[PDB]
Amino acid sequence: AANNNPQGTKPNSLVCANCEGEGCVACSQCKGGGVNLIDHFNGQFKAGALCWLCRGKKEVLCGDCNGAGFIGGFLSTFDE
Amino acid sequence: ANNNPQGTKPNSLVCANCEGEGCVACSQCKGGGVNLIDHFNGQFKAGALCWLCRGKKEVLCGDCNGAGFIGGFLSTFDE
Amino acid sequence: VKDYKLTYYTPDYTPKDTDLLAAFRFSPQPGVPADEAGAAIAAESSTGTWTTVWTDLLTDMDRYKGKCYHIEPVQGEENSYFAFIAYPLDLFEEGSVTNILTSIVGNVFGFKAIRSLRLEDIRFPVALVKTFQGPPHGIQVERDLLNKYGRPMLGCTIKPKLGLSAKNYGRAVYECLRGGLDFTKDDENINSQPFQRWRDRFLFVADAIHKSQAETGEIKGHYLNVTAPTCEEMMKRAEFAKELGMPIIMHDFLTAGFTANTTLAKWCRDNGVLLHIHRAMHAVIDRQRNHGIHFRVLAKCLRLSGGDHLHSGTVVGKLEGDKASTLGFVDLMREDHIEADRSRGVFFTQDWASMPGVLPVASGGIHVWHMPALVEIFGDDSVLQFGGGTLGHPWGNAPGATANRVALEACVQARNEGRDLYREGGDILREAGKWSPELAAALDLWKEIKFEFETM
Amino acid sequence: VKDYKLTYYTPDYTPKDTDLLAAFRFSPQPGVPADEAGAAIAAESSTGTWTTVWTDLLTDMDRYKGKCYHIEPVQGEENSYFAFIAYPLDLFEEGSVTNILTSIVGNVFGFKAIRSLRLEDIRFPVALVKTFQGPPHGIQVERDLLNKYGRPMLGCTIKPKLGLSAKNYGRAVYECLRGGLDFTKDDENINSQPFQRWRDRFLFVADAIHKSQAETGEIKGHYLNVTAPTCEEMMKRAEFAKELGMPIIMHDFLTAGFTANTTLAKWCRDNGVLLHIHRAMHAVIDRQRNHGIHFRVLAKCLRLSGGDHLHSGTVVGKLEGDKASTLGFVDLMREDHIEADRSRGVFFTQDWASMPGVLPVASGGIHVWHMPALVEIFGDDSVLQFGGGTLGHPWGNAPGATANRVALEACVQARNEGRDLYREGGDILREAGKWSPELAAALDLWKEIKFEF
């Protein structure tokens, strides 16, 4: 995505890198625009309407900082 | 007899005042079992059973109350 | 005691088949030997003496005595030893975990001449296993009650939301259960708190369960948290939850205790509900590798006291130094005969005497790209909880459930056909995420992992 | 809003009077700052997020999250800090201490970016203190029930414990109590083993109590262990011990749990029984100085949940530092208002709102030569448990009881007149052991006189 690291913090602090500590990133199908630009399936989603992924919000959750802002805890890692 | 600390053995856990046996020899009748002099009011007269051990010739150890080792719980939790 | 070998360290002694064995890992203070420390650990957790001047009136002695029979060093660590000691069977009450704990680990962990002490394992004889109840139902009975064969079960905790009304809570539960999940879990902090009392929560959750189960066609549930301040409040919550017709409840066995957990397990056995155990406040006892009580001991004590599901932790991220130990104590609570294997942490050979097994629950920040791994490690006798990997789908609650369901079915169906699950995980998921938009969006949101260049 | 601010470390925030404060001592991994670690401890033990993308869906947040407000470092130690955290009041339910435990010390101890974490103190607001029951009776009511004024109380434990029939148990208890002691204690491993069941032990102990009390004129007692495998068995044992007429029972609050302890405390309040709390299985949680839960937090949680006596351990042989801390939390068990004094371990000012006290108990291998020190440190609001110091006398059990009784009375009478007990305690013991043979034998057996400064 925006960062190709598997799951990583900033150099020292615990703040997440991919989301920059916001918890939400910009859609990668419409590039924040909000409308399709190519048919993405057989005929289910045609270009010129709401983006199929973000449904028109231009923002999605982040993958690693799994909604949180850092890289510990019951949200972004495994229980031992 | 009267030593300063509870006194573990050198580089060990065993009690010293008894060398691990748990009981010591009475320091009043010298293991004899019979009094030597008058003690309180002439009520413990020389010639009868020792007033401390009462003829058993052995009393309990003091630093290690029969435990035999020091760091235990019936001999140590006065720290 | 003397040059005489302490009367407690008897290396030529072999234990009976009705003795409770225990393995401590200890590290002594500077200037103290190892054999004396072993004998002292043996004497502290029993009659607290080496000599014979107290426990000798007429005959009673050496019967209620914890002989120590093996001391060895630990490879790699310096100044650290393993002490195997063995207790008789007449010291322990019949049917009480509290007594076993209070007798073994009562006041030995405060020994002064020991720098640190850990309890690594324990072995209950069959004669003692058969005086306890065990889990209310087990694995086969619980799999038959819910009618879920073949695949592992799915669940979704609602963790990050707090301060929600009771009706919106019921609504989220309904949206998840309708979409294709099996269970749903209350946050363990939720109790009768002023913004959300318990009876309202129970009512609306029961309504959601009935609706979704009637309009879907299979059996669905929700772990209701019945942890309470007293015995009376707890039994009252449990009775009301049974009245509504709920299949499963919840409890945590470390803040509430073992007396309450045993009482609740007997009630659940009488009334036919399943019990899900949540391990909270456990890192306070078993995180540091040099002091405390390792967790496999508590897993055994829970299999004895009662419980059908148990949180065990995932192993997708651990190395082989700890993945091995976790797989070890996961086999310690499903099978019926475990052979000693020190590489997997099992110290003694344990035979469970046809007592049922418990069910491991793998949870905590997992998503779709982990599904190939889990289905390969835990097998299909387990439960999978998806905290954030479900409620965060780009367009709702029910689509996330549908995505996870599709991924699990694809992975299982692929494993049945002989295909590998460490080389072809990504392939399976990508080729399945082509006739379903939900799984495509889910695959696009998270990121692949590629565990270790081909495998593990 | 970005985590260049952390939204949780608000240093100028002043905590309200209805907020629950907690003080952690933590040590972070090599490469993590201190402020980030404080904010992460505040977020782990609450809604586990720094961001508002998840919770604040509908204009509601900031009222269910804790916030760090002070991260001072530790003097002397290297790479260790203190972190103060303040939790709102509407996160916890009333009357439940299991909820407080599972909400503060839940998963925070399993955090990965922390090398070690310990919980040192905690402050309950009065708003929350007032919803718990507290001790069944307290201190004043207990002294009035037992009718013993102006001196500590005396108790003895029975070490021949294992493999001793119920009738010989009763006879030993009778000998001890007849000599002059007040309480006898039942060992903490003895519940219902096959060699000695509980009903036929309660019987003979009650018989001995009735004999010795009708013979001496005082009020005698024996702590009867009611720790059972279930709620029903526990209630059965307690009801039987009440029917016989026993004035005090025993329990273990760390192996049996807090639910069972609260249940038993409510029963004991409704039925007029006193409750003595034994602290088995505590070093497994609070020995190491760098991971666990300090014992004063558990003492506070106990005073809230219920209990009349509490074991606290001797303080005579602790040199300093770790001694002044112990005294510290003794003041957290008897007083009503305790000002902050970090030298004695007390971190926050605690006000108990006229809730009763709890009685300390000292034990662990003390003999007659320790009588002055104890009587000067703990005062007169305490119990003194003797192990071998009573059963080891060369003459028997009743002489040992008489010896300890005489020594205690002498030390108390000497303190009343205005005599220093640290300097001339042994002098008092020797001047008293002249007209009594038992005290002389005792003074001659436990050779260690003292450390007289």
Curated annotation (Swiss-Prot), chain A:
<keyword id="KW-0862">Zinc</keyword>
<dbReference type="GO" id="GO:0008270">
    <property type="term" value="F:zinc ion binding"/>
</dbReference>
<keyword id="KW-0150">Chloroplast</keyword>
<dbReference type="GO" id="GO:0101031">
    <property type="term" value="C:protein folding chaperone complex"/>
</dbReference>
<feature type="binding site">
    <location>
        <position position="59"/>
    </location>
    <ligand>
        <name>Zn(2+) 3</name>
    </ligand>
</feature>
<dbReference type="GO" id="GO:0061077">
    <property type="term" value="P:chaperone-mediated protein folding"/>
</dbReference>
<keyword id="KW-0143">Chaperone</keyword>
<keyword id="KW-0934">Plastid</keyword>
<protein>
    <recommendedName>
        <fullName>Protein BUNDLE SHEATH DEFECTIVE 2, chloroplastic</fullName>
    </recommendedName>
</protein>
<keyword id="KW-0809">Transit peptide</keyword>
<keyword id="KW-0863">Zinc-finger</keyword>
<feature type="binding site">
    <location>
        <position position="30"/>
    </location>
    <ligand>
        <name>Zn(2+) 2</name>
    </ligand>
</feature>
<feature type="binding site">
    <location>
        <position position="24"/>
    </location>
    <ligand>
        <name>Zn(2+) 3</name>
    </ligand>
</feature>
<comment type="subunit">
    <text>Interacts with the RuBisCo large subunit (RbcL) assembled as an intermediate complex made of eight RbcL and eight BSD2 subunits.</text>
</comment>
<feature type="binding site">
    <location>
        <position position="54"/>
    </location>
    <ligand>
        <name>Zn(2+) 2</name>
    </ligand>
</feature>
<comment type="function">
    <text>Chloroplast chaperone required for RuBisCo biogenesis and translational regulation of the RuBisCo large subunit (RbcL). Stabilizes an end-state assembly intermediate of eight RbcL subunits until the small subunits (RBCSs) become available to produce a complete stable RuBisCo complex containing eight small and eight large subunits.</text>
</comment>
<feature type="binding site">
    <location>
        <position position="22"/>
    </location>
    <ligand>
        <name>Zn(2+) 3</name>
    </ligand>
</feature>
<keyword id="KW-0677">Repeat</keyword>
<keyword id="KW-0479">Metal-binding</keyword>
<feature type="zinc finger region" description="CR-type">
    <location>
        <begin position="6"/>
        <end position="77"/>
    </location>
</feature>
<feature type="binding site">
    <location>
        <position position="51"/>
    </location>
    <ligand>
        <name>Zn(2+) 2</name>
    </ligand>
</feature>
<dbReference type="GO" id="GO:0009507">
    <property type="term" value="C:chloroplast"/>
</dbReference>
Swiss-Prot record, chain C:
<feature type="binding site" description="via carbamate group">
    <location>
        <position position="185"/>
    </location>
    <ligand>
        <name>Mg(2+)</name>
    </ligand>
</feature>
<protein>
    <recommendedName>
        <fullName>Ribulose bisphosphate carboxylase large chain</fullName>
        <ecNumber>4.1.1.39</ecNumber>
    </recommendedName>
</protein>
<dbReference type="InterPro" id="IPR033966">
    <property type="entry name" value="RuBisCO"/>
</dbReference>
<feature type="active site" description="Proton acceptor">
    <location>
        <position position="159"/>
    </location>
</feature>
<keyword id="KW-0113">Calvin cycle</keyword>
<feature type="modified residue" description="N6-carboxylysine">
    <location>
        <position position="185"/>
    </location>
</feature>
<keyword id="KW-0120">Carbon dioxide fixation</keyword>
<feature type="binding site" description="in homodimeric partner">
    <location>
        <position position="107"/>
    </location>
    <ligand>
        <name>substrate</name>
    </ligand>
</feature>
<keyword id="KW-0479">Metal-binding</keyword>
<comment type="function">
    <text>RuBisCO catalyzes two reactions: the carboxylation of D-ribulose 1,5-bisphosphate, the primary event in carbon dioxide fixation, as well as the oxidative fragmentation of the pentose substrate in the photorespiration process. Both reactions occur simultaneously and in competition at the same active site.</text>
</comment>
<keyword id="KW-0560">Oxidoreductase</keyword>
<keyword id="KW-0460">Magnesium</keyword>
<feature type="active site" description="Proton acceptor">
    <location>
        <position position="278"/>
    </location>
</feature>
<dbReference type="GO" id="GO:0004497">
    <property type="term" value="F:monooxygenase activity"/>
</dbReference>
<feature type="binding site">
    <location>
        <position position="279"/>
    </location>
    <ligand>
        <name>substrate</name>
    </ligand>
</feature>
<feature type="binding site">
    <location>
        <position position="187"/>
    </location>
    <ligand>
        <name>Mg(2+)</name>
    </ligand>
</feature>
<feature type="binding site">
    <location>
        <position position="161"/>
    </location>
    <ligand>
        <name>substrate</name>
    </ligand>
</feature>
<feature type="binding site">
    <location>
        <position position="311"/>
    </location>
    <ligand>
        <name>substrate</name>
    </ligand>
</feature>
<keyword id="KW-1282">Carboxysome</keyword>
<dbReference type="GO" id="GO:0000287">
    <property type="term" value="F:magnesium ion binding"/>
</dbReference>
<dbReference type="GO" id="GO:0016984">
    <property type="term" value="F:ribulose-bisphosphate carboxylase activity"/>
</dbReference>
<dbReference type="InterPro" id="IPR036422">
    <property type="entry name" value="RuBisCO_lsu_N_sf"/>
</dbReference>
